[PDB]
Structures are given as structure tokens and as C-alpha cells.
Design a protein around this ligand. Sequence first.
Ligand SMILES: [Mg+2]
Ligand SMILES: [Mg+2]
Ligand SMILES: [Mg+2]
Ligand SMILES: [Mg+2]
Ligand SMILES: [Mg+2]
Ligand SMILES: [Mg+2]
Ligand SMILES: [Mg+2]
Ligand SMILES: [Mg+2]
Ligand SMILES: [Mg+2]
Ligand SMILES: [Mg+2]
Ligand SMILES: [Mg+2]
Ligand SMILES: [Mg+2]
Ligand SMILES: [Mg+2]
Ligand SMILES: [Mg+2]
Ligand SMILES: [Mg+2]
Ligand SMILES: [Mg+2]
Ligand SMILES: [Mg+2]
Ligand SMILES: [Mg+2]
Ligand SMILES: [Mg+2]
Ligand SMILES: [Mg+2]
Ligand SMILES: [Mg+2]
Ligand SMILES: [Mg+2]
Ligand SMILES: [Mg+2]
Ligand SMILES: [Mg+2]
Ligand SMILES: [Mg+2]
Ligand SMILES: [Mg+2]
Ligand SMILES: [Mg+2]
Ligand SMILES: [Mg+2]
Ligand SMILES: [Mg+2]
Ligand SMILES: [Mg+2]
Ligand SMILES: [Mg+2]
Ligand SMILES: [Mg+2]
Ligand SMILES: [Mg+2]
Ligand SMILES: [Mg+2]
Lengths: 65, 102, 61, 89
Amino acid sequence: MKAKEIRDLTTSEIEEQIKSSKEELFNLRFQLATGQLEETARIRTVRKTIARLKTVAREREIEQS
Amino acid sequence: MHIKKGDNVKVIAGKDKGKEGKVIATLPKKDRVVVEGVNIMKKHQKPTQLNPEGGILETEAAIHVSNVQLLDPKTNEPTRVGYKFVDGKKVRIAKKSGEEIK
Amino acid sequence: GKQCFVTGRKASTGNRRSHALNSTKRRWNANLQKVRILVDGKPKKVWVSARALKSGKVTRV
Amino acid sequence: EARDILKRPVITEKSSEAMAEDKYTFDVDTRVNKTQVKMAVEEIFNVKVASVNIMNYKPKKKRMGRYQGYTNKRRKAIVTLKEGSIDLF
RNA sequence: UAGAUAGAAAAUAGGUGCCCGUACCGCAAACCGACACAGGUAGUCAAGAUGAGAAUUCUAAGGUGAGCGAGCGAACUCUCGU
RNA sequence: UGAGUAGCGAAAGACGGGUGAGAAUCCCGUCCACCGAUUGACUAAGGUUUCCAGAGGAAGGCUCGUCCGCUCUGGGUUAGUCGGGUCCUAAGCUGAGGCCGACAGGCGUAGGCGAUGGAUAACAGGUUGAUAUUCCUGUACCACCUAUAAUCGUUUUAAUCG
RNA sequence: GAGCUGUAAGUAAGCUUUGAUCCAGAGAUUUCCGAAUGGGGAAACCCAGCAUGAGUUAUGUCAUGUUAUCGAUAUGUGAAUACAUAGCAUAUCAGAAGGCACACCCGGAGAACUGAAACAUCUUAGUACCCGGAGGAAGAGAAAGAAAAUUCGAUUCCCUUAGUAGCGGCGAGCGAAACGGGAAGAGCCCAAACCAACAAGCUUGCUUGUUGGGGUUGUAGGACACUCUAUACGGAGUUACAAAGGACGACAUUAGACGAAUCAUCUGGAAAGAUGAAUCAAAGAAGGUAAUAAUCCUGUAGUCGAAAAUGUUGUCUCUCUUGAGUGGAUCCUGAGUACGACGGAGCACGUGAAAUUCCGUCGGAAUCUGGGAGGACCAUCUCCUAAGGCUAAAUACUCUCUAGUGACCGAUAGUGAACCAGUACCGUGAGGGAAAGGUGAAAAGCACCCCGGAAGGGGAGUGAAAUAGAACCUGAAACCGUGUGCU
Ligand SMILES: [Mg+2]
Ligand SMILES: [Mg+2]
Ligand SMILES: [Mg+2]
Ligand SMILES: [Mg+2]
Ligand SMILES: [Mg+2]
Ligand SMILES: [Mg+2]
Ligand SMILES: [Mg+2]
Ligand SMILES: [Mg+2]
Ligand SMILES: [Mg+2]
Ligand SMILES: [Mg+2]
Ligand SMILES: [Mg+2]
Ligand SMILES: [Mg+2]
Ligand SMILES: [Mg+2]
Ligand SMILES: [Mg+2]
Ligand SMILES: [Mg+2]
Ligand SMILES: [Mg+2]
Ligand SMILES: [Mg+2]
Ligand SMILES: [Mg+2]
Ligand SMILES: [Mg+2]
Ligand SMILES: [Mg+2]
Ligand SMILES: [Mg+2]
Ligand SMILES: [Mg+2]
Ligand SMILES: [Mg+2]
Ligand SMILES: [Mg+2]
Ligand SMILES: [Mg+2]
Ligand SMILES: [Mg+2]
Ligand SMILES: [Mg+2]
Ligand SMILES: [Mg+2]
Ligand SMILES: [Mg+2]
Ligand SMILES: [Mg+2]
Ligand SMILES: [Mg+2]
Ligand SMILES: [Mg+2]
Ligand SMILES: [Mg+2]
Ligand SMILES: [Mg+2]
């Protein structure tokens, strides 16, 4: 998910998205450990999505001040 | 590079000097290009690899980009390339005919 | 780190000289004396040189 | 933070025997304690944890060509379930 | 005791209890000696016969046959017996 | 070059059967021999993966090598009670202010740190290739928390804490 | 503007013209140790308080913030001891700390080997080392100067004076300065007299103190008195001369864009070489490309370009601000100072006839009819006006960045280090400290067969070459072998 869609989202929605993305990343890591993950690029995709969500949240709590 | 994937080029230096072909790959970091039917190498392929059948495989090896020259769209002669700006977009121009290449 | 509280008068270095002009390092110390004077409006025992004390220019209290 | 406390499951012969005994082995963040591991497991897998054993593994010397180095240090926990089960697959 | 404050709990039941070390060598081929080195390395346990004994000789529990061998059976050198 | 010379670092091996391209040298067996106040069993330092399993034989191993403390691959160390910390202090170290000293800094009070000593609650059995007072079985103990409490107290108190 | 997920090949999974990767400006995130600062500690670890919050029935557990010391400024409290002074407690602070560029600067402290053909004065040398303090430069600086004429007019730096004058067990050696020629230039502010306001002593005399004004010097200046001049007209300014800003513009730096002109044959694996015939040039710098290229590529000359940040500047704005003359009655013009003695030091100058200048100790002036200097000292003359402060430039240096250069090196050289080097290795530690570059144009890096367990090899094939097959360009010598003509 890109920064434009994230900026469309609301702050509570960003927090919920961060939670769900973290759960997805964790499940991917567990599948990788057990040898059940073929689509390894998903891990990096989700990690960068989490980074973008946090970046936008930080931008908002900065512009608030 | 001034040569681009898909261009029709003439070889101006090498064993294949005078051959024409299509640019099917470029290597910007090596200043190299791959041209169909040009620079054929015979590589020893082990049948024991992931491909069962093996032997001597013939394929194009990359050539240095300064050894191929664009062919003029009108005259079909080798030509250098300039650049124009049409409505704020860069256009490749053959320096012999002045026509847009692509 | 010993000097006159009032003037900063402090020790210096130089040579002791023999009759044959051999040289050895020595110091000239100030003639400091521990006196009670008024520092920031309160009595305080500080080191003051005799020369700074001369002619009652410093108040001992 | 539970998903950060637990890093991955450990799948070995000894770990499989433990799993037969209802003990599940995980590599965990090197900074966490036994209690944090228990709470993370209960939060993530909706089980009841009977106990947690924990241990540290030193960096291990490892070689590749002419380059000498070390593997990461590890913190390994063994979580004994009271109620429920965990399916790693 | 000075102080403190309405509350205190014999028992019963239930529950909570972190971090570090934990492998292996450790009179040694893994420690200190450049060595798979006749050296050095604190402490604990330490059976039977003999005996005053933890000495002596032979054994137990347990461990070990020593990281070049095969012949020959000269001088000479070493270690040993007469 | 010396020269295929000196050396191969305290010692008792023999044979049979395996394995292997190859065996005095690896594995298994029998007999024999050596230590046994110990060459046995623990364990503190120190080392730091050397431990275990499978594979290998260039180099290392004073020979050989099918083997290894070597090489490759994958594993292995589980604690309220064991040792240390969340307790104590010794020598010593450090040290707010302080004293002293060209600078740097030295000394030192209160206070801290600091085991080689003080305090301090878990034992037996079983189990793996590799951990076990740590895992498992049985049976305990210590501190704390929550609920219910025989009973006692209820503002000079008098139960309770200290 | 078409590929991309580094070295770094591979496989896998993916991304990218709905513009990836990549390049530049700005921003976000930025674990732990480290001055390291909640406390402790054998750095990268351990153990807490407090507040708020998460979780649990509750304890246990967790999250975030905060809690060092000293300093300064406030507030409260306040001992011996009455008054209040130690002290104590709280709050605020982009206050300090620590690092380093093995350079340059200023200062504290300060050797020795060495030279003197020995050695002590002397030299090495105020050097090395240590320590403190900086700054982008520092230091110095607007005459108590240099001099001796037609005088000059702050300081610093270069040339010269000059190896002169001098110093010196008059040994070894040490060694100026003024003048003259140059770089660069810039001048200012206080203290005091006096005035006004405020406060204490309460003569409630007018003394003291604070604030503001005034004032700044040798042609003596100022106060003071008087006369003109102006309330920013003018002038000045954040580089001193007082100190903060704002608007707009220009230029520059940090990515980039365009950018002329060659074909053929011969040799060859390959042409840029040779041959022939052309072309551009404000571009014939350079690198690359299968051998040696102005015209193949990257570029070069030339021209263009910035969303954003930064820097330097200009104009407005802003801010600040009176400027001259006359008079000589009184007043002011830097005190434990100048200076002296003794002991040291510094001056090129070693105590000397020793001026000039600093330190310790002790003594200790004058007040414009004054004071200092002109190398002891006195007189005269001449030049200055100490005992307060500030100040750009010309000068020094280079860890660093950008663009370049070399009758500098070319792998035992050049850095110790062309390479995963301050590494490996050595040492308890400080510390010492290596060796080691080259396949090929392209990886086309030897399919397949054969002997062998493997290693290794013989073919076959790739390649111009394998006799370039992996520390793989060339491949000398020592040294080691096989064969042999003569012996
Ligand atoms: Mg443990
Ligand atoms: Mg253990
Ligand atoms: Mg053990
Ligand atoms: Mg002993
Ligand atoms: Mg004996
Ligand atoms: Mg022989
Ligand atoms: Mg001999
Ligand atoms: Mg012999
Ligand atoms: Mg022999
Ligand atoms: Mg032996
Ligand atoms: Mg082993
Ligand atoms: Mg061998
Ligand atoms: Mg102190
Ligand atoms: Mg102890
Ligand atoms: Mg064991
Ligand atoms: Mg701390
Ligand atoms: Mg001499
Ligand atoms: Mg001499
Ligand atoms: Mg200055
Ligand atoms: Mg003489
Ligand atoms: Mg004059
Ligand atoms: Mg100013
Ligand atoms: Mg171009
Ligand atoms: Mg061009
Ligand atoms: Mg040609
Ligand atoms: Mg004197
Ligand atoms: Mg004089
Ligand atoms: Mg004088
Ligand atoms: Mg004279
Ligand atoms: Mg300057
Ligand atoms: Mg060479
Ligand atoms: Mg070198
Ligand atoms: Mg070198
Ligand atoms: Mg070669």
C-alpha cells in the first residue's frame, strides 16, 4: 500500500492497518521458518508497507505540533 | 545509451561487421548490447544440470555498444543520433535524414 | 593553585645561579598570608599577599 | 509486541520430541524475559501456558571462504502448554 | 522503645515467582609452556589383601596399551643385573 | 649442501572377524599387559564450541589412516530452591562538599563499589546421540498475591506494624 | 527514461513507462555502548525511584516520560546563635562537560644525547615531550613610537640593510634594528573632571553609592563659560567604532540538458593500423571501443538548466546619531602605579658602562611650571603623553571538499596498506607489524569419451592462442631431471 492511499486513510485506520500488517508479516515469517513460504517477496512488501504507515502517522503527529 | 531494446542496428566493427539485426537486450552498466544472430558463442552445456538434455548451445553474446549503429529510417544507412524537443518530449533524430527514429 | 585572592599574585619560575653560573630551576613564591576579609559581604579566610595588604587597602573582618 | 517477542519456531529432532510432549520451541528476541514470552504465546496462539524454560546460545564461529565471522547470538524458549495446542503447519 | 493505624489471621483454597551461568576439556592432545611438548596447574572423593600408614607390592571401581613400524641381536654410548 | 643423513617426544601387545580402492595404524571380538592416594570419579580457574550425529580424506596428525580435538553439513546447554545478581560487609578501589598542589592532578569526609568470608527455600528416581538437584515422575519447601476464615482489635489505644 | 532487488555469481520470489533502480535538495526513522548524565559496572551489561498507562481477580510482568555533577539565576526554609549567615529543599537554563587536523596560534612548565674535537659558562634550545586556552586564523595594533630632516605618523607580513653592528670560556658559536623598497591599510571606546535623577549616612551641611548624560587628548585635550549649528536635514551601521530584524532582486554551490564531422579496401580473431578518397573544428583535452580513432561511444569547445536547501552580495527598509569655534580663572587627564634596592628572567646584547622590558620581595613619586624617551648618567634640545579597553586586511597552516597539474612511483617501487591492512601475526600491556596485483576481446570458464576412489591426465571441443584452463600475460637465474656427440 502506497503513501497516497495511506494519506486517504484516517489515523485510527492507520493504526488498525499497522496491526494487521504486523500480524501478516509474523505469519509469513512463521511459514518461512516451517518451510511453507514460496512467495518470499511478500515479506519485504509488507515490511515496506508498515514503514510507510508509520511514516505517514509520524508526519501527521508532526504537523499537529 | 543511444541504442535501445528493439532497435534495428548495423554492426560496424567485429567479425559480424556488416550484419543487421534487432537489439534484444542491453547491459547499461557494461555499455553492451545483444543483437540477434550476432556474436554467436558455442557454450558447453552439461546435460547433468537442471536441463536434462545438454551439449553445445549456440547463443548471442553481448557486443560493445559502440560497435553497432542505428539504421536511418529513410535511407537505411548507418547514422548517428541527435535529440529534439517536441512539445516538451525528447525525440531521437537520425542525423542523416533528420527523421524521428521510433 | 595558590595565589593572592585580591590581586592574583602568584609564584614565578627562574634560575638559581652559582658563582660558576651553573643554573638550577627554582620558584619565587608570593608572600601570601591567610587573612579573614569580607568576601561577598561575608567573612572568609583567604590567601592575601603582604603587598595587597599593605597600607590598609584590604579590610580584614 | 508479542509478534516481536516471538521470532520463529524451532524445528529440530529434539524440538519435535518436545512437541510430542506438548512443549513448543521458539527463538525469541534476545532482550525479553520468560514472562514476556509466556504472555506473547498466550496472546498469539490463544493457549494456556503451563511454564516457560529459556536459555541463551553464544555466537558461533562460522567460516565462508577466507572470511571469518560469527552467527547471531540466540535466545531460545521452550513453552509448555497447559491447555490447547499450537499448529505450526 | 520513639513512632504508626482498625484492622490483624491460626487455618482452607487458588495463584505468582525475573536476569546471568549451565555444552565440552579441566594432572590435560582442549588450561600456562610457539608443538597432539617427560614441565607447571587450587580444592573434593578415594575400595580389597599387607601394614602404623594416604608407605610398600598385587588387585577393585574405573580407565589405559601411549600416532611410526619390521628385522638384526656388531663396535660405541646410555639404562639395568651378575 | 649436509642427506635419504639426525630425528619420529617415557610404555605391551597378539590374533580372529568386519569395512574399504587401499589397513601394523579404523571398527568389533577374545586373550594379554599398565595405573589404581590412581592413567579412576568430581570440580574451581583458564580455554571458548573443542561437545553430538551424519559425511570426508587436500592440508594438519612427526608413519599410515577407511580414523581424529582436522574439514563439511546439521544439531546440542531448559532452574523460585545449584553458583552469581534483585542481600552483607573485608583488604582494596572510588569519593558530593572538602584539604593540597605551576598545569596535569594528589589526598580525603559522608556515601558507594568490592569475595577469597557472613546470610540464604528441593530431594530421590527415570530419561537422550548430545542437558539435567534445570526435563519427566513422585513427594517437598521459601517469598509474595487473592478469596474465605475459627478467633482477637476498634483511636491515651494496645489487636496489629515498628 | 528502461531496466531493477550492492559487492556477488546462483536459485527463488518479485518490482518497473500508472515512470523501478539510479542522481540531487529537504524531511522521517535512527537499537545498545560511549562525555554517558537514575544507581552500579570487568564499555556495548546489570539493578532502581517517581509519574502516567497496558495487562492480571491480585501479585509477578510490560510501555512511555523523567531522575548525574557543577554553574548561574529565582523561590521557600534556615544551625551553632538573636538578627541572619552556613546549610538544606524546589524550579529554570540549546550554561559547562567530551572529541579532534599527529597542522597552524597563544600561554604554563621544560630535557638530553649533541657542538665546544675533553668539560662546567656557553651550545643543542626555549627545541623535543607534557599541560592549558583557543580561532578560523591567532598574536599584534592606533606612539609615554622611530629619529635627528624639507622629518615620519597604529599593527602585521615580504625584500634589503647583513652574516653588518654587536654578543661570546671574545672559545664553539649566537646575531639584530632603524633607514630604503614593497603587500595591505582603519580607526575607535572608556576612567576622571562636571551635570541631572535616585538611595544611605538622616546637619534633615553636603559626603558616599547607583543610574543616565558629558568626555577622550600632545598642534596638549576636555570639564567649565560663551558663540554658532540640528533634532535626523545630513551622517553612520551589526568586521571594531551601539544592536536586532524584514522585503525584493542578482550571482554562486548542491542533480542535469543539447552538443560538429568517415566511408571503402588490405592484413587480421578483431582496424582505430596501412592504402584511397572525404568531412568537422570556438570541439585535434581525455578515456573507452576485439591493435594505434578529431568524425564509433563517453566526452571536449560552446550554449542552456533548478522544485528545494545553502552561501555571498545589492537596493529598499530598519536601527542609531548633532556638528564646529573662542577663552585662558578654576577643575580633570588611569597609585601601591611609575620608579628604586636585592634575586631572577627577557631583550641578537652571557651584568656588562647596560639603556629599553617583565616576575618575586621590600621600599615607593610627580601632577602640565607635570610625566616618559633619545643605550650608564647630567644639562640642553627634540620627540612623545605610561600605569584602561576594542579593532578588518596584508601573514601561518591543511583533517577535508571541488577542479586540475607533474622531464614524480609503477607491485622488493609508490603509503605500512593497488588486494577485506593498521588486517594476519607477536606482546599482560603500552606497543610492534607483514606477505599478497595481471585468464581472455568476450566466460565463449573445456558438452562428450577414456584410465583413476579421488587427485591428475589423454583425447574431443571453445578460443587468434589452452603451448591463455583459475595466484591462469611474460616466464631470467640458482636448483632438479631425461636423452645423448666427444670423453
Ligand atoms: Mg537458566
Ligand atoms: Mg549442564
Ligand atoms: Mg556438564
Ligand atoms: Mg603445587
Ligand atoms: Mg603407591
Ligand atoms: Mg640408507
Ligand atoms: Mg653423514
Ligand atoms: Mg648413521
Ligand atoms: Mg636412526
Ligand atoms: Mg611416540
Ligand atoms: Mg568428537
Ligand atoms: Mg600423513
Ligand atoms: Mg570534587
Ligand atoms: Mg564466595
Ligand atoms: Mg554430558
Ligand atoms: Mg546511566
Ligand atoms: Mg664535547
Ligand atoms: Mg668531541
Ligand atoms: Mg586578535
Ligand atoms: Mg680563556
Ligand atoms: Mg610635538
Ligand atoms: Mg558591533
Ligand atoms: Mg551528448
Ligand atoms: Mg559526437
Ligand atoms: Mg574502417
Ligand atoms: Mg636586576
Ligand atoms: Mg635612560
Ligand atoms: Mg626609565
Ligand atoms: Mg644618548
Ligand atoms: Mg587579521
Ligand atoms: Mg613484476
Ligand atoms: Mg609495498
Ligand atoms: Mg610493505
Ligand atoms: Mg604465466
